[PDB]
Coordinates of C-alpha atoms and ligand atoms in Angstrom, one line a residue:
Chain A
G1 CA 113.0 72.4 90.8
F2 CA 111.4 73.5 94.0
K3 CA 108.2 71.7 93.1
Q4 CA 110.2 68.5 92.3
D5 CA 112.6 68.9 95.3
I6 CA 109.3 68.5 97.4
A7 CA 108.5 65.0 95.6
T8 CA 112.2 64.0 96.0
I9 CA 112.4 64.6 99.7
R10 CA 108.9 63.0 100.3
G11 CA 110.2 59.9 98.5
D12 CA 112.5 59.2 101.3
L13 CA 111.5 61.5 103.8
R14 CA 112.8 60.1 107.2
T15 CA 116.3 59.7 105.6
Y16 CA 116.2 63.3 104.5
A17 CA 114.6 64.4 107.5
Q18 CA 117.2 63.0 109.8
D19 CA 120.2 63.8 107.7
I20 CA 118.9 67.7 107.0
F21 CA 118.2 68.0 110.8
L22 CA 121.5 66.3 111.8
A23 CA 123.3 69.1 109.4
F24 CA 121.4 71.8 111.3
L25 CA 122.2 70.6 114.7
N26 CA 126.0 70.0 113.8
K27 CA 126.1 73.4 112.3
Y28 CA 124.5 75.0 115.0
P29 CA 125.1 72.8 118.2
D30 CA 123.6 75.4 120.5
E31 CA 120.3 74.9 118.8
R32 CA 120.0 71.4 120.8
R33 CA 118.9 73.7 124.0
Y34 CA 115.4 73.9 122.4
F35 CA 115.3 70.0 122.3
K36 CA 115.2 67.7 125.2
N37 CA 117.8 64.6 125.4
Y38 CA 119.7 65.5 122.2
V39 CA 122.9 67.0 123.6
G40 CA 125.9 64.5 124.3
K41 CA 125.0 62.3 121.4
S42 CA 126.4 61.6 118.2
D43 CA 124.5 61.0 114.8
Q44 CA 124.2 57.2 115.0
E45 CA 123.1 57.4 119.0
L46 CA 120.3 60.5 117.6
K47 CA 119.1 57.9 115.2
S48 CA 118.7 54.9 117.5
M49 CA 116.5 57.0 119.7
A50 CA 112.8 56.5 119.0
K51 CA 111.6 60.1 119.3
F52 CA 114.3 61.6 117.2
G53 CA 113.4 59.7 113.8
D54 CA 109.4 60.2 114.7
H55 CA 109.4 63.9 115.6
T56 CA 111.9 64.9 113.0
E57 CA 109.8 63.2 110.3
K58 CA 106.8 65.0 111.5
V59 CA 108.7 68.3 111.4
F60 CA 109.7 67.8 107.5
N61 CA 106.0 66.2 106.7
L62 CA 104.8 69.7 107.7
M63 CA 107.8 71.6 106.1
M64 CA 107.0 69.8 102.9
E65 CA 103.2 70.8 103.0
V66 CA 104.0 74.5 103.6
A67 CA 106.4 74.2 100.6
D68 CA 103.9 72.4 98.7
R69 CA 101.0 75.1 99.6
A70 CA 103.5 77.7 98.5
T71 CA 103.5 80.0 95.3
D72 CA 106.7 80.8 93.9
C73 CA 108.5 79.8 97.2
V74 CA 105.9 82.1 99.1
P75 CA 104.3 80.3 102.2
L76 CA 100.8 80.7 103.2
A77 CA 100.2 83.2 105.7
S78 CA 98.1 80.6 107.5
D79 CA 101.0 78.3 107.5
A80 CA 103.2 80.6 109.2
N81 CA 100.5 81.5 111.9
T82 CA 100.3 77.8 112.5
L83 CA 104.1 77.4 113.1
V84 CA 104.3 80.8 115.3
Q85 CA 101.1 79.6 117.5
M86 CA 102.4 76.0 118.2
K87 CA 103.1 75.4 121.9
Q88 CA 106.2 73.5 120.9
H89 CA 107.7 76.9 119.1
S90 CA 106.9 79.2 121.9
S91 CA 110.6 79.7 122.8
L92 CA 111.6 80.7 119.1
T93 CA 112.6 83.6 117.4
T94 CA 112.7 84.0 113.4
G95 CA 116.4 83.6 113.8
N96 CA 116.0 79.9 114.5
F97 CA 114.4 79.4 111.2
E98 CA 117.0 81.5 109.4
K99 CA 119.9 78.7 111.0
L100 CA 117.6 75.9 109.8
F101 CA 117.4 77.0 106.3
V102 CA 121.0 78.0 106.0
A103 CA 122.0 74.5 107.0
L104 CA 119.0 73.1 104.9
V105 CA 120.7 74.8 101.7
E106 CA 124.2 73.8 102.7
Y107 CA 123.1 70.3 102.9
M108 CA 121.5 70.3 99.2
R109 CA 124.5 72.2 97.7
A110 CA 126.8 69.3 99.2
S111 CA 124.5 66.5 98.1
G112 CA 124.9 64.2 94.9
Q113 CA 121.3 65.2 94.1
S114 CA 120.2 68.0 91.5
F115 CA 118.4 70.1 94.2
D116 CA 117.1 73.5 93.4
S117 CA 119.0 74.9 96.5
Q118 CA 118.5 78.9 95.5
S119 CA 114.6 78.2 95.8
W120 CA 115.2 76.7 99.1
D121 CA 116.9 79.9 100.2
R122 CA 114.2 82.2 98.7
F123 CA 111.7 79.9 100.5
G124 CA 113.5 80.0 104.0
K125 CA 113.8 84.0 103.5
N126 CA 109.9 84.2 102.6
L127 CA 109.1 82.0 105.6
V128 CA 111.1 84.2 108.0
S129 CA 109.7 87.2 106.5
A130 CA 105.8 85.5 106.9
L131 CA 106.8 84.5 110.6
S132 CA 107.6 88.0 111.4
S133 CA 104.5 89.4 109.8
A134 CA 102.6 86.5 111.9
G135 CA 104.0 88.2 114.8
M136 CA 107.0 86.0 115.7
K137 CA 109.9 88.0 117.5
Chain B
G1 CA 113.8 94.0 88.5
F2 CA 110.0 94.1 89.3
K3 CA 110.7 96.7 92.4
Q4 CA 112.7 99.1 90.1
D5 CA 109.8 98.7 87.5
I6 CA 107.4 99.9 90.1
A7 CA 109.7 103.0 90.6
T8 CA 109.9 103.6 86.9
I9 CA 106.1 103.7 86.6
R10 CA 105.5 105.6 89.8
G11 CA 108.0 108.2 88.6
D12 CA 105.7 109.1 85.5
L13 CA 102.2 107.4 86.4
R14 CA 100.0 109.7 84.3
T15 CA 101.8 108.7 81.2
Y16 CA 102.6 105.0 81.8
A17 CA 99.1 104.5 83.1
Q18 CA 97.4 106.1 79.9
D19 CA 100.0 104.4 77.6
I20 CA 99.4 100.8 79.1
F21 CA 95.8 101.3 79.3
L22 CA 95.4 102.4 75.5
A23 CA 97.7 99.6 74.4
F24 CA 95.1 97.3 76.3
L25 CA 92.2 98.7 74.5
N26 CA 93.8 98.7 71.3
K27 CA 95.2 95.2 71.5
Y28 CA 91.7 94.2 72.6
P29 CA 89.2 96.5 71.1
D30 CA 86.0 94.6 72.5
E31 CA 87.1 95.5 76.1
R32 CA 86.4 99.3 75.5
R33 CA 82.5 98.3 75.9
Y34 CA 83.1 98.2 79.7
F35 CA 84.2 101.9 79.5
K36 CA 81.2 103.3 77.9
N37 CA 82.6 107.4 78.2
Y38 CA 85.4 106.1 76.0
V39 CA 83.8 104.7 72.9
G40 CA 84.3 106.6 69.9
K41 CA 87.2 108.7 70.8
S42 CA 90.9 108.8 69.5
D43 CA 93.8 108.6 71.9
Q44 CA 94.2 112.2 71.8
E45 CA 90.4 112.8 72.4
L46 CA 90.7 110.8 75.6
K47 CA 93.7 112.6 77.0
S48 CA 91.4 116.0 77.1
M49 CA 88.9 114.4 79.1
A50 CA 89.3 114.9 83.1
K51 CA 88.0 111.3 84.2
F52 CA 90.2 109.5 81.6
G53 CA 93.5 110.8 83.0
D54 CA 92.6 110.8 86.6
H55 CA 90.4 107.3 86.6
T56 CA 93.3 105.5 84.6
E57 CA 96.0 106.9 86.9
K58 CA 93.9 105.6 89.8
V59 CA 93.6 102.4 88.2
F60 CA 97.4 102.1 88.0
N61 CA 98.2 103.5 91.3
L62 CA 96.3 100.6 92.9
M63 CA 98.0 98.0 90.5
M64 CA 101.1 99.6 91.8
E65 CA 100.2 99.3 95.5
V66 CA 99.3 95.6 95.0
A67 CA 102.4 95.0 93.2
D68 CA 104.6 96.7 96.0
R69 CA 102.7 94.5 98.6
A70 CA 103.5 91.4 96.7
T71 CA 106.2 88.9 97.6
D72 CA 108.3 87.4 94.7
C73 CA 105.2 88.6 92.3
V74 CA 102.7 86.8 94.5
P75 CA 100.1 89.5 95.7
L76 CA 98.1 89.4 98.9
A77 CA 95.0 87.5 99.0
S78 CA 93.4 90.6 100.5
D79 CA 94.5 92.7 97.5
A80 CA 92.8 90.3 95.2
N81 CA 89.7 90.5 97.4
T82 CA 89.6 94.2 96.9
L83 CA 89.7 94.1 93.0
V84 CA 86.9 91.4 93.0
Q85 CA 84.4 92.9 95.6
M86 CA 85.2 96.8 93.6
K87 CA 81.1 98.0 92.1
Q88 CA 83.1 98.8 89.2
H89 CA 84.5 95.2 88.6
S90 CA 81.1 93.3 89.2
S91 CA 80.8 92.1 85.6
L92 CA 84.5 91.1 85.1
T93 CA 86.0 87.6 84.8
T94 CA 89.5 86.8 85.3
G95 CA 90.2 86.7 81.3
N96 CA 89.5 90.4 81.4
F97 CA 92.5 90.7 83.6
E98 CA 94.4 88.0 81.8
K99 CA 94.1 90.4 78.6
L100 CA 95.5 93.4 80.6
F101 CA 98.6 91.9 81.5
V102 CA 99.4 90.4 78.3
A103 CA 98.9 93.9 76.8
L104 CA 101.2 95.3 79.7
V105 CA 103.9 92.8 79.2
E106 CA 103.7 93.4 75.4
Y107 CA 104.1 97.2 76.0
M108 CA 106.9 96.7 78.3
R109 CA 108.9 94.4 75.8
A110 CA 108.3 96.9 73.0
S111 CA 109.5 100.0 74.9
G112 CA 112.8 101.8 75.1
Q113 CA 112.7 101.7 79.0
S114 CA 114.1 98.4 80.4
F115 CA 111.4 96.3 82.3
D116 CA 111.4 93.0 84.0
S117 CA 108.6 91.8 81.7
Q118 CA 108.7 88.1 82.8
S119 CA 108.2 89.0 86.4
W120 CA 105.1 91.2 85.1
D121 CA 103.7 88.0 83.5
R122 CA 104.4 86.1 86.7
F123 CA 102.7 88.5 88.5
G124 CA 99.8 88.5 86.1
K125 CA 99.4 84.8 86.2
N126 CA 99.6 85.0 90.1
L127 CA 96.9 87.8 90.4
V128 CA 94.6 85.7 88.2
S129 CA 95.0 82.9 90.5
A130 CA 94.1 85.0 93.5
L131 CA 91.2 86.4 91.8
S132 CA 89.8 83.3 91.0
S133 CA 90.2 82.0 94.6
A134 CA 88.5 85.3 95.9
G135 CA 85.5 84.3 93.7
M136 CA 85.9 85.9 90.2
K137 CA 84.1 83.5 87.5
Ligands
HEM201 C1 109.6 75.3 108.9 C2 110.4 74.9 109.9 C3 109.6 74.2 110.9 C4 108.5 73.2 110.7 C5 107.6 72.7 109.6 C6 108.5 72.8 112.0 C7 107.4 71.6 112.7 C8 107.2 71.1 113.9 C9 106.5 70.0 114.0 C10 105.5 69.4 113.2 C11 106.7 69.6 115.4 C12 106.2 68.6 116.1 C13 106.9 67.2 116.2 C14 106.4 66.3 117.1 O1 105.3 66.6 117.9 O2 106.6 64.9 117.1 C15 107.8 70.4 116.0 C16 108.1 70.4 117.4 C17 109.2 71.2 117.8 N1 110.0 72.2 117.0 FE1 109.8 72.8 115.2 N2 109.4 73.1 113.2 C18 110.1 73.9 112.4 C19 111.1 74.8 112.8 C20 111.9 74.6 114.1 C21 113.1 75.3 114.4 C22 114.0 76.1 113.7 C23 113.1 75.0 115.9 C24 114.5 75.5 116.8 C25 115.6 75.6 116.4 C26 112.1 74.3 116.2 C27 111.8 73.9 117.6 C28 111.0 72.6 117.8 C29 110.8 72.0 119.4 C30 111.6 72.6 120.6 C31 109.7 71.4 119.2 C32 109.2 70.1 120.4 C33 110.0 69.3 120.9 C34 110.4 68.1 120.0 O3 109.7 67.7 119.2 O4 111.3 67.3 120.5 N3 111.1 74.2 115.2 N4 108.1 71.8 115.1
HEM202 C1 95.1 94.6 88.4 C2 94.3 95.4 87.3 C3 93.3 96.5 87.9 C4 93.3 97.5 88.9 C5 94.7 97.9 90.0 C6 92.2 98.1 88.7 C7 91.9 99.3 89.5 C8 90.5 100.1 89.3 C9 90.4 101.1 90.0 C10 91.0 101.6 91.4 C11 89.0 101.7 89.6 C12 88.3 103.0 90.1 C13 88.9 104.2 89.2 C14 88.2 105.5 89.7 O1 86.8 105.5 89.8 O2 88.7 106.5 89.7 C15 88.5 100.8 88.5 C16 87.6 101.5 87.4 C17 87.1 100.6 86.5 N1 87.7 99.3 86.2 FE1 89.5 98.2 87.1 N2 91.4 97.6 87.6 C18 92.0 96.8 86.9 C19 91.7 96.0 86.0 C20 90.4 96.1 85.3 C21 90.0 95.3 84.1 C22 90.9 94.0 83.6 C23 88.7 95.7 83.7 C24 87.9 95.4 82.4 C25 88.5 95.0 81.6 C26 88.5 97.0 84.5 C27 87.3 97.8 84.3 C28 86.9 98.9 85.0 C29 85.7 100.0 84.7 C30 84.9 99.5 83.4 C31 86.0 100.9 85.7 C32 84.9 102.0 85.7 C33 85.7 103.0 84.9 C34 85.8 104.3 85.7 O3 85.3 104.2 87.0 O4 86.4 105.1 85.3 N3 89.5 97.2 85.5 N4 89.8 100.1 87.9

């Protein structure tokens, strides 16, 4: 289930982090306008960039702690507040988070792993709701 | 589901509040000691008393609002705080609340009306956790 999937991702975090984030950027290529130096590059050229692996692992490090601190896929309001008040997230609306979780769930449903993809969908939805309550447009 | 259940209960509140509360005291008779005006009265005698109908409805009115404000059966920390810091709940421990929800779920599973009883179980567990966090021994 959801709690298990957390441990699964954390067991091979950078690989899942890069692969899921690549799924997101390939599903929604105009999302790359929020990042610097990601455009014009294939999967293998994002992966030999130093910052891509590092930054993206940090993203999922935090995503897994937010998931881990959740109850029944409901994230802490304090975790949503952190995500909204991060300088690096100042350009975002909740719709950017919706796209990420749509791509995440799609990735899980296509993988050869026994993920609980319905829970990740509930979690993405609950996080969007929480981001709105914490004041993200 | 859980949301429909709130509407079912709200629709005929005086009746559900009294029925569930009595199912609580009858399953756990020791609990009556906390409601000193109800000691030594039959089910029918309690209904003739003004503060029984009126205080029990208010009990369940609050319960329904906590339920309505929950996400996926997870109540707000602020709502758990209110229940803890109520003059009337000063002598209580989380076990008192655990007993209420056991009786409530049992009542629901025995009824003719169709209830999402596993959700009310979940809600009870989550609320007990929130009460403990908020400082209830
Ligand atoms: C639950 C979802 C998310 C979590 C936990 C998360 C977490 C993070 C973390 C930890 C960083 C800092 C990384 C570092 O400094 O190395 C970061 C940076 C950033 N995030 Fe996210 N993030 C999430 C969703 C998103 C989404 C959906 C977008 C846009 C589509 C986004 C845009 C950015 C940008 C533009 C930066 C700074 C630039 C960069 O690191 O290259 N965030 N976020
Ligand atoms: C989530 C479940 C509960 C909710 C929403 C709740 C809510 C309330 C509210 C709003 C009152 C004030 C009623 C009034 O003065 O009209 C109250 C009174 C009281 N409650 Fe709680 N309660 C809950 C569970 C419990 C439990 C588990 C016990 C102990 C077993 C308890 C014991 C009392 C007592 C002894 C009073 C005073 C009696 C009265 O004022 O009529 N309640 N309850």
